[PDB]
Design a protein around this nucleic acid. Structure first.
Lengths: 226, 223, 214, 224
RNA sequence: UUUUUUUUUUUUUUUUUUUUUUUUUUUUUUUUUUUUUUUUUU
């Protein structure tokens, strides 16, 4: 398209994920359940492909019967459109929903047990995670979880570090997480004042499985030089 | 019935699909209009059919091959890319595996039919690796996509072909997912991976003495 | 061959047509979206397209679509590259007039090619705007900067050389290349070590920690 | 969309000699250096155009002359059967390169005229010029590899330098590696007719690779 | 066989490089005798 517009922009983000989250709970909270989040997280790659080929700057997406108004910045032309502070992109929505699950799971053993039986995080799994490793690590794998380092006990930060180190993830992608804040204070503040917690959580994820695999044998293909 | 609506739905363990049942239903429906010309046409225009079905948005695109019309389920459109396929019904892959199975069975029972199939049907996935009908119909037809559904009928060749593709091309080992959970007759994978290692090594050896690299008469000076 | 195109004659004609609609917001928008618009043109099979930046419509010859790579461009015609040069020239001339207007320019216009290297408005409008594509058409206006950045891009960054073709045949006022790459050999070298003082190119975010590993 | 039917099977080497002569029969009478000059200017453009339209056969005009061309450039037509003695854009270029080459060698004066009209931008970009000789200069034309003997192995060796200097995909050299040299097959001449190939290699090796003014001198006065 | 790369000359043209933020985008996406992705002849 042949029309180009401003796009005023400053330094300092006005976006505070904590306020965005609460606005999201305000709008959709009464409609959420684990089935709705279950559908979101298995169809999240698919919805992104839809949005990538869809030429409206905002789209109504329905996951498990609940309809969400989503800002579409995936379609190439829209990649630099401004997003309101209380609007949800696919990425933001994913982080909010992960945070909602964790807020529901932190409270009660019963809610944890049902979340664990219904909700699948394809991203955690392929690294050998499972609900067994605790809700904060498993849900910390969600896109957008890096907006809540406090709620996910630093896991999204160190999960990304490990992705640069063990996988060959473009060293970008870490751009966002490195300027997120932690509960109280800014990055420069938690970068060394919470270094002990971070090194601890780095270690926790560091003792997770590889986990490039699919069942024994395995013993079979090794026999043929793998 | 709307790319903007996602459900719901369902999980997801245990496959019900039995290739042997699906094959007989496929022969039941289309058997009488099958001949080597129809098969010829399919295998030459598979890949193109994969590219075309890829872009078209109906869950069952009706394809005609060699003047024969087939009711084809389509999961290639990258949004039907998951979507329930009945135990009878064919995608393109299933239809290739059937056909492959059908040719091999027709060849099994008749040397004369073998000669006719040898003259008409081309498997370009086999050819580029230097595999000819001369290497035996179970190997040559074992290159057909979907042949891995019938490990018994193609003497494990689909399996070993894929091992060689992992080893000398750099095929993502995750392409072997399907074949490593197929059956060999009634035997589950877990069982033939141990019990049938000798035949599998024989098939491996074997496909391993076929011609590869680029196309490569005897090139020198440097490469 | 000899080139008929005089950027000075193109520039005045560009202002004759569009000047009454121009302002620093329109320029701000052009330079933010210059890359985007190039990619748009590369995909569109019209030999001429109307592009709107900041509400202002420009009729732009499209030689970006591969087939049109060697269609002849009229001398009063406007390609994306030429328009970038002309807008940059116009900003510069407006800034000369008063150090106000220059204040205005400094707050609204962004040169992303200049950024990325440590160049900013604080390093002087001639050096900042010299990073704009097409500025090489006016070496006089930009104190040779477009030439000298590019030399620095040939060796810092591995720019192919050969992109340097256009600038080495540009004029300097009425002085031809042969002549200025001799008679102005001094002021050019001076411009060289001056851009040499920027962040020579690049680790944008740290090195405020990370370095448990990388 | 609809399927379909077979196409073939199998090739040989379609004999370019036979194709060339058929081509020289049909158009070889309307051909002149102005028409050839124009072809080798708009060859790239022509195949960019031949690529958009859905006609398996098109009439193109070079220097006021109209040519029947099979269109396998349009993605769908890529694997269409081309006849022996029908011309694609590649084949036409090869035939027109072979023509000119047979006119030069046959006489001086024609060599002079060909030098003044014919421009081979593929050759020029390597700093190859008419002064390096008509077999090397015209060898840069697409379809020259079709006549390895007429172009003294240059199309083969030119490809080798494209693999080694420029980052060409090598699979582009699959066709030349199956061409003939005179009466000898490819398995023969990559043994029986070396020395020539080594000579051609070094001969085109001795070329530049593009090269503006000198300055040079001033770029050299800074860095190169 | 065929297609895909390379396309002279100029104060032409094209190819490269494209801020900023607790923005945005690009990476990684469970499970099955399921499905999708790779490989397609002279």
């Amino acid at each position: 398209q042949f029309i180009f517009e401003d796009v005023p922009q400053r330094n300092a983000a006005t976006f505070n994920p904590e306020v965005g989250y609460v606005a999201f709970i305000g709008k959709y909270g009464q409609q959420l359940n684990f089935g709705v989040a279950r559908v979101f997280f298995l169809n999240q790659k698919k919805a992104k492909m839809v949005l990538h080929k869809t030429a409206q700057p905002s789209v109504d997406l329905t996951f498990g019967g609940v309809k969400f108004t989503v800002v579409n910045n995936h379609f190439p032309q829209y990649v630099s459109n401004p997003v309101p502070d209380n609007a949800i992109t696919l990425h933001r929505m994913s982080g909010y929903l992960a945070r909602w699950i964790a807020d529901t799971c932190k409270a009660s053993v019963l809610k944890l047990a049902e979340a664990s039986a219904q909700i699948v995080m394809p991203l955690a799994e392929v690294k050998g995670c499972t609900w067994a490793d605790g809700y904060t690590m498993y849900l910390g794998f969600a896109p957008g979880a890096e907006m809540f380092l406090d709620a996910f006990d630093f896991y999204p930060l160190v999960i990304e570090m490990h992705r640069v180190l063990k996988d060959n993830m473009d060293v970008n992608f870490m751009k966002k997480v490195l300027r997120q804040r932690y509960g109280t204070m800014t990055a420069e503040e938690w970068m060394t004042q919470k270094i002990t917690e971070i090194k601890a959580a780095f270690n926790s994820v560091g003792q997770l499985a590889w986990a490039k695999s699919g069942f024994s044998p395995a013993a079979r293909t090794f026999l043929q030089q793998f």
